[PDB]
Amino acid sequence: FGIRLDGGTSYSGAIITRYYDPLLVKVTAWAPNPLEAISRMDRALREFRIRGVATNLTFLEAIIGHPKFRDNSYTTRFIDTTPELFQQVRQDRATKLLTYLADVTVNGHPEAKDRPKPLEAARPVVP
Amino acid sequence: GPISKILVANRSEIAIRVFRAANELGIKTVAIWAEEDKLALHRFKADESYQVGRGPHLARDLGPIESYLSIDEVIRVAKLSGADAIHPGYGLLSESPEFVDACNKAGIIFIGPKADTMRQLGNKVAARNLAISVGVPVVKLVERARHVESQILGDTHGNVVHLFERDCSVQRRNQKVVERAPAPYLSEAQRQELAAYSLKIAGATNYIGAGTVEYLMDADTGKFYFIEVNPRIQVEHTVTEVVTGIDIVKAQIHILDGAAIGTPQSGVPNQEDIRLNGHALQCRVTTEDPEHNFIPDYGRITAYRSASGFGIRLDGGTSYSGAIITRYYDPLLVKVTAWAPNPLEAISRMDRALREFRIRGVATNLTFLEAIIGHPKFRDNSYTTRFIDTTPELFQQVKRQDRATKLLTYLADVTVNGHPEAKDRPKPLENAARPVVP
Amino acid sequence: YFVRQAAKGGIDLFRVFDCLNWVENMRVSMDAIAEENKLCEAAICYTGDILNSARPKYDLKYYTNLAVELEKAGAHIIAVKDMAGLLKPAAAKVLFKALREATGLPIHFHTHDTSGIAAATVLAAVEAGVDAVDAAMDALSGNTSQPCLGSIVEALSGSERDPGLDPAWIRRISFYWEAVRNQYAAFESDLKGPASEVYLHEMPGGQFTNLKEQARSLGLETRWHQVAQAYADANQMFGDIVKVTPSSKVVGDMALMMVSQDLTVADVVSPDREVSFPESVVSMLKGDLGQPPSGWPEALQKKALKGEKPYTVRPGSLLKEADLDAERKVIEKKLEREVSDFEFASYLMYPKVFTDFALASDTYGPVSVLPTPAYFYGLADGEELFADIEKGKTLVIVNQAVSATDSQGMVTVFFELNGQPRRIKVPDRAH
Amino acid sequence: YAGNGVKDGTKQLLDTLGPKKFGEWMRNEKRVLLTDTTMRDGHQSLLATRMRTYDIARIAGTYSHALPNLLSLECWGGATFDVSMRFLTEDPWERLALIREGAPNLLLQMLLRGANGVGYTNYPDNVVKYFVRQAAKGGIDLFRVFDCLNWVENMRVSMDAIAEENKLCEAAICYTGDILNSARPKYDLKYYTNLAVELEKAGAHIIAVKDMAGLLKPAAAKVLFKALREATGLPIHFHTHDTSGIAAATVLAAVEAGVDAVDAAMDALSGNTSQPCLGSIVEALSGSERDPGLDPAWIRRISFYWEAVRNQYAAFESDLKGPASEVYLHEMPGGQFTNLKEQARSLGLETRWHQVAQAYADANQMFGDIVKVTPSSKVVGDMALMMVSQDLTVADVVSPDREVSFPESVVSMLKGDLGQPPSGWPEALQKKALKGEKPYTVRPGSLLKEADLDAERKVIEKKLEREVSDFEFASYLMYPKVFTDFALASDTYGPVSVLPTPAYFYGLADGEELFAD
Amino acid sequence: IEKGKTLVIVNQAVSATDSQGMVTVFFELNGQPRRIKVPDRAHGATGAAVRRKAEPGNAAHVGAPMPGVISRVFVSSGQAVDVLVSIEAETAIHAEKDGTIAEVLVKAGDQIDAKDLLAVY
Ligand SMILES: Nc1ncnc2c1ncn2[C@@H]1O[C@H](COP(=O)(O)OP(=O)(O)OP(O)(O)=S)[C@@H](O)[C@H]1O
Ligand SMILES: [Cl-]
Ligand SMILES: [Cl-]
Ligand SMILES: [Cl-]
């Protein structure tokens, strides 16, 4: 509800060439109120699944999620003068753990990666 | 506290519909899946997910549908996940008072009406007498019938509103095929008469949540007759949303959070601010094959490209190229909703979108849907509930040239087996320069 | 210091052994254990065959005399540690009767099921009056492990020494271990079952698979039964010794060299055949593992040490007291933080391994909380993981996407973490 | 490498003493006698009986020269007879002849089912007798005969045929339950000693205790073998499986209690569902009063040969990891375990395996608590799988108000096709399952007439368009379709049994060379 | 194919002959993958398309719900409403009705795709 698409050009197996504008799809979100319309656009962008090429989705999401976008106080200079749209910080336990998971997911474990794998398998259940 | 995690006790397009509303409201979601739905997209579209129907706590694995009807399985995963509320979607457990009871016993909010509302409305004796008691006509004939239904919303504070009506007369055998909002054959006066009956039913039942009051309209006399209340969201809610601008699913959620209809927090306007804007219709694209007596097809989908643009809403999220359609569940591929300021234009918009879709690998009902909305009786709103069952030209086989597939077959055959005349004869110098037309 | 921390950490029962059964080399630990008021179970390792008159070095009195010495050294329990599973049922009946006459201390029997008959030896020991025995849950028993706990219990059910353990609960806990073990498919050996050849080579159950894999590495897979024979020959060449960690490793190193280099024991001790001894062999013959009761064979020792003088005193008697305060300061400075007494004990045992682990933990946080398949394989696309970092307090983690690798050679993994997006960069370790 | 020449062994004692005085010689013998099961039961349990003649025949000479004191090689019957033809495209008779030739000093032993020889159904008495006659001529000396319900009357026909051929009749009693458990008194000590007496009166030369599931415990062996040797003057022969991981304890306890012979498998094919380890059992007995006089070094050398042979059969290994005391709950025969687990997996029940094992125990009690060995064990397996598949309790199964379509094997067993358990079949279950068909309580073979053997011979001879040998005719009588298919494949492919195993299963790689005799 | 209807066709890959004697040519047609199977007549596969092929209609037909290799066949002539075959990917395909099966088109350690005809009542 409230999402309009004007694409028609992208699909699984499409080749993006260097020749023209690198457009995938134009997304328009509607709601009775401007904040709801933002939440709607944000849900749709985050729900898209595009693989095989990088996209500007996280940039679009940072923009519409920014406090000044939400309160309509931005100027034509907003993006060009807002560093946090292009950055990010964390140091906590969960981030370290996600760092492990990422590392093993990409690189495998040295003790396991070249050895026989477990059948593709019932998790152990404590009595 | 306020709802912060919702489990959707459903699958496929309606689960994905609820996930969208909930996430837009900043609410976490939980999906459930049967083993047969292990590759189902709804499973991957929630914030968290659990399998239902297998595992050592059960004496035997449950069936593909049985898994989702298991009140015990649903409650078990709702507890595991810490869900505050359960949305039942439509079908499955959405009309089960036993399930509402189980929810309340567990301290989990059921997103829909009370168990006693369900029990009253589910018995035809009670439902008829309630309608009779508030001066709503009940059934005679009806040989030339239309099916018209009012969308209602009621809150926990005694407020009920209507979101006008839908036409659901286009039915095959006894199953809904194309729904329209508003009902195009009604006058304004008729539209308001129907709204007044529906508000009476809603208020008399102290209805909470989204429900539909269904009527039969006698096409010969213009008389309405109350048939049943469906105490849940329906597959055809989408046409109502597009012509009123009101999100039914968000409204269900706010209502069960305790919001009052009329306040910005409820997502619902006061009655005086609810109005119709244009015309919409919805078509469900399925694997039902008009070339094979509407037996649903199944197998891998080799190609899937939807078509959107101005005035097209899609509720799918389940088909893609690669996807396997099984015969375990209903054969829906995608629900397409088309809107325009006027009904003939909305038809032309549906027709363009349906013809622009490309779905390969499985058969679909696209040509049959096209045939229906292209029919003069559909365009002039003169059909009854018997229209499809008595209209054979709708069933006329289409027969494609399918020229490109035949050419590829030729090219494959010659690439692998050679041409008998070029055989073991000399070959052109392999360069080799194409003739250029001067 | 280590024994002190082990007791504080929760160990109640310390089974203490020495790889040459040298009681002198066990006294410092036994004293430490008693000092902490915990159980000192002093083990005698079993080797040879007490019922074989042709090998009298390891006869019955050898074991009963050691039990007497260990009791005088303050043991609370005597163990028979049969690390290679060589003790046969008839011998157990003689051995455990004699041990319980020789000392009033309780006796605890530990064996391995390499021969496929160790349960017979356990049950003979029980019939003979042994006080306690070891076994492994069924799902991790047999072959080089301990004999089967469930079946040993069932064998004794209803008897006068019935241990009073519920077989249905043993089964349930074993079913759990079976499922756990399935996760460790990478680490399984190719051993198919029982092997009487154990009575030839006497490789400890804990060594057998490692040594075989190590032979395969050196291109010796087709000559494994020659390695096993060289292992037996080398044992005799060293004077017929107890072979358990780390003396077993020395005999394995020697045997692999003999097979790789085509050397018989006569070539090994020969005046005129240059031999580059494995460092573990030189070190053992120097005295670093202690002293067997007849000492080291001299012609062999002389040849291996190449002029370096052996010693016969207790190895630890040669080491200066550690300055524990200074050592603690060292690790704390490396890690730029205080360490607990437990971590300090880790650093004292394994300075490099500990230091590396302490740095890894700083980078990756509490990886032990991850379920085993996530630990070894991470997350497939769209896969969901539940992990508890705190005792609340479940993290719902989903792998949403993994980027191609840039340049800077990094890869971005996109997670969902409790409904929230989280991007994590890591090196592509293959570019 | 062996020798020399071959020393006379048990074959020569049988030949010169005759079967009855050969059994007396066994009884009198102070040393325990050993049967090696590597060539039959060992690979039936561990490698789906796929071990080929090429690998078996090539080591028989080695056994003859190196272990001339062995009682027997168990090398025939059980599943080898049909598997050799159906899956290995080779002749079980030829395999037996090559072993005979290679090991002329050792007794050759088969497992025979009393009711049907090596077959898959019941056959007329004349057919069963004809087969025993051919087995004797082909080289079998020692027939271990069993019945799946321990029904002596169903063993008489085979026992009498074996005695007629002047071969050894080793009548087996299958072990089940637990004699020292006074809360399962049906299979108590008198049950076994009464059976041993009945079998001696029926003309047995040797009594076996066939512990097909590896359930006999050491303390029970001590009581049982003492009692058996007091109950009959006949020698006693003990066969068990190592599923529990403690069966060598039971074998050693049996030896101490005076048992005359015991079975074991070479180390490389021992343990788990196979027999316990031969070399370690012999090591445990080394230097003792009952020392069997077998060279451990030679046992290890032959085992190393079997280890290298087994490696060629990687396709047929199961995923079994070790001991399981669960065996005392379910009582599945060691020869059944992997087959039944593979069946459960194929039915979608791999994750409810332990539930199947419990249904197997419950189903056993439902049938009245019966002996479970081929074919009765299969019936209990079928029942258990259905109970898990359909979520049926024993109460559901027997109830007058729950419809059940029983497995065919169950209907046939309750009808009487497998014989009679000492108790008869439970009446309510049998009535429900038979759906109006009348059961019978007589010996199944007494209802089958006499086969017309000259007419059956002409049928196979016409089909193959040639005369067949008496051995081939015995093959056809037992397995008509399997034999026919084999004879036709032999016509096309020749003596493939002579090919090395890797070439048999995988052919030749490019540039690869083989030698075949 | 006609004026203003220009197709772009690319030969992406050609498979080995499969167990049915068919070669798959993987085309790109107007940018979209299309797989086309033809008999390998060049290598003696005239007479080939091989495996039927269940009709979604009839009752009658036992069609594969999913692609895989068959791991076990449990039937060849009639019973109940019972596992007929299993498919490894093990499932575990059940008889939907009472009957006598009059054909088993598998077989197997055979590879199959969803809709392949497994057995006929
Ligand atoms: N009295 C009637 N006369 C003619 N047609 C009827 C009548 N009652 C029901 N129908 C038909 O049945 C359709 C819906 O019937 P319902 O009474 O809603 O039954 P139902 O099974 O509850 O249907 P659903 O799936 O819950 S809407 C209508 O649109 C009509 O086509
Ligand atoms: Cl179902
Ligand atoms: Cl270290
Ligand atoms: Cl047959």
Ligand SMILES: [Mg+2]
């Ligand atoms: Mg209705």
Ligand SMILES: [Mg+2]
């Ligand atoms: Mg209804």
Ligand SMILES: [Mg+2]
């Ligand atoms: Mg004797």
Ligand SMILES: [Zn+2]
């Ligand atoms: Zn140990």
Ligand SMILES: [Zn+2]
């Ligand atoms: Zn057996």
